Write a protein that binds this ligand. Sequence first.
Ligand SMILES: CC(=O)N[C@H]1[C@H](OC[C@H]2O[C@@H](O[C@H]3[C@H](O)[C@@H](O)[C@H](O)O[C@@H]3CO)[C@H](O)[C@@H](O[C@@H]3O[C@H](CO)[C@@H](O[C@@H]4O[C@H](CO)[C@H](O)[C@H](O)[C@H]4O)[C@H](O)[C@H]3NC(C)=O)[C@H]2O)O[C@H](CO)[C@@H](O[C@@H]2O[C@H](CO)[C@H](O)[C@H](O)[C@H]2O)[C@@H]1O
Ligand code: NA
Ligand code: NA
Ligand code: NA
Ligand code: NA
Ligand code: NA
Ligand code: NA
Ligand code: NA
Ligand code: NA
Ligand code: NA
Ligand code: NA
Ligand code: NA
Ligand code: NA
Ligand code: NA
Ligand code: NA
Lengths: 103, 97, 103, 103, 100
Amino acid sequence: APQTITELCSEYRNTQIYTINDKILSYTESMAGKREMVIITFKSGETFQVEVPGSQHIDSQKKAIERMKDTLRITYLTETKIDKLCVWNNKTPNSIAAISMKN
Amino acid sequence: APQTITELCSEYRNTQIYTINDKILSYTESMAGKREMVIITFKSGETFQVEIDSQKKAIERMKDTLRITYLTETKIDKLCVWNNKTPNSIAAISMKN
Amino acid sequence: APQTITELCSEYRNTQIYTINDKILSYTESMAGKREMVIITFKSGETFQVEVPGSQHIDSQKKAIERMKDTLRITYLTETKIDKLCVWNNKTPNSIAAISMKN
Amino acid sequence: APQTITELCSEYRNTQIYTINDKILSYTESMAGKREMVIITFKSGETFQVEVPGSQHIDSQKKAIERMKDTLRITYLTETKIDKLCVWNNKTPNSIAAISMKN
Amino acid sequence: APQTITELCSEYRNTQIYTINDKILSYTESMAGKREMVIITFKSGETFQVEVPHIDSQKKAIERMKDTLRITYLTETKIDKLCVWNNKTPNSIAAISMKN
Ligand SMILES: CC(=O)N[C@H]1[C@H](OC[C@H]2O[C@@H](O[C@H]3[C@H](O)[C@@H](O)[C@H](O)O[C@@H]3CO)[C@H](O)[C@@H](O[C@@H]3O[C@H](CO)[C@@H](O[C@@H]4O[C@H](CO)[C@H](O)[C@H](O)[C@H]4O)[C@H](O)[C@H]3NC(C)=O)[C@H]2O)O[C@H](CO)[C@@H](O[C@@H]2O[C@H](CO)[C@H](O)[C@H](O)[C@H]2O)[C@@H]1O
Ligand code: NA
Ligand code: NA
Ligand code: NA
Ligand code: NA
Ligand code: NA
Ligand code: NA
Ligand code: NA
Ligand code: NA
Ligand code: NA
Ligand code: NA
Ligand code: NA
Ligand code: NA
Ligand code: NA
Ligand code: NA
């Protein structure tokens, strides 16, 4: 298996690493029908989502989507710094595939 | 997908934005009725509640979010609410600062 | 719908308000037998429970009981003040129907 | 129903109270081989476990075991003092039936 | 039953104890398809994974271990030892102990 977020990101076609080195500025959570999603923003200007679950997700990803939303909420509330994001760069906004937290 | 709570709120009928800019004053949780109800109030006097499988998971998540937001004294920026319920029902929450 | 715990509690038979205005003194969690009790006590001497009733089989009611047990545990660990409890007064100790926290 | 962990523990022949009055010294969590177990130790030298028994198949009993594992982890990480444990003395390490926290 | 992480680790082939005595430097979580995994690193240079999910009880234990590593990281809690499957890349966590 990959040993870093950068190695993991390199295994997929539509993915890109963003170096963030910052805490989350804003956390938005929606339970509105067809938009059950989380949006995060940084003071540096980047906005990212965790996508609404759909056919782009295999069964093993359903629990992982719920875990990632849990992780973003507690990361926001604790003002924990995000090091890197691996994102699907074909979505609007960019969709989080993996997160690393450091410092 | 929308990139802000204001853009998301604009996609639905019977919704409006409340600008809160404050921490939750009170958190109430009840299992007395047919549906579990969570009610939050602000010092302004404004009161809000929480109303397929993906919709059930999102309702449980929103209740979890309001509880931990209350306990951590975290400031709420905006709420997107359904204004056809009394008290108004939360569709989305944003937190900043 | 009700806007306060006092209004909500007035809608139910065999319920009363206890005004607490205090943090939980002790938290007890048991998986002995089938009631799976959580017991909280206050410095006042008052004791309350959250239990799974023998009669209770409906999934949404079980999820609400699990949520209330989660709320009492994190309220205890964070030393958060409880304002009021709405309790079923026909059980010993009284069983919690609703909780409010303020201040 | 019982109002204290000592009263609850007295209802079962194969249980006994250990009075701890201390935080957990060590927390061990294992998913090696067939049964997940959690082991806690105290400075006194006393050691206790939470596991799902091989015989145990009922969903409500599994949910209570998962809750107790969650409670021991957050109690350890928050350095929260344990008052008493009610334990099954049927096997070693003794298995936790109930936990109380105070002070 | 075993009373220590060393005793638990000894029951299985392909396991090793690592003495860590340190807080986690970085926590990585992925929801990418076929790589739903956690990676943790230490400033001392060690990297470990929690593997992609086994019967249902093993899947629940993997989800619990990922939960434990996240809150251990956020609380800056010291890890004493790890029991790892040493045949996996990176080494895969079978058990964790925390003290001090
Ligand atoms: C369009 C294209 O160029 N396709 C390539 C192919 O690329 C990889 C993809 O293969 C699909 O399967 C192919 C299958 O291999 C073919 O044999 C069959 O005929 O067509 C199928 C359909 O294309 C997989 O279905 C793809 O999986 C999906 O991949 C997308 C990413 O693109 C994922 O979506 C992402 O999801 C995440 C969340 O999980 C985010 O939301 C993100 O935003 C979103 O983008 C899906 O999750 C994923 N789904 C599943 C179920 O896994 C993908 O793996 O590669 C093959 C082999 O290299 C090429 O085949 C070659 O084609 C050339 C002609 O170009 C020539 O004929 C060769 O002989 C032949 O091998 C395809 O052309
Ligand atoms: Na932006
Ligand atoms: Na701050
Ligand atoms: Na803050
Ligand atoms: Na407070
Ligand atoms: Na405060
Ligand atoms: Na039980
Ligand atoms: Na304190
Ligand atoms: Na006993
Ligand atoms: Na300490
Ligand atoms: Na304390
Ligand atoms: Na070390
Ligand atoms: Na920190
Ligand atoms: Na620090
Ligand atoms: Na600590």
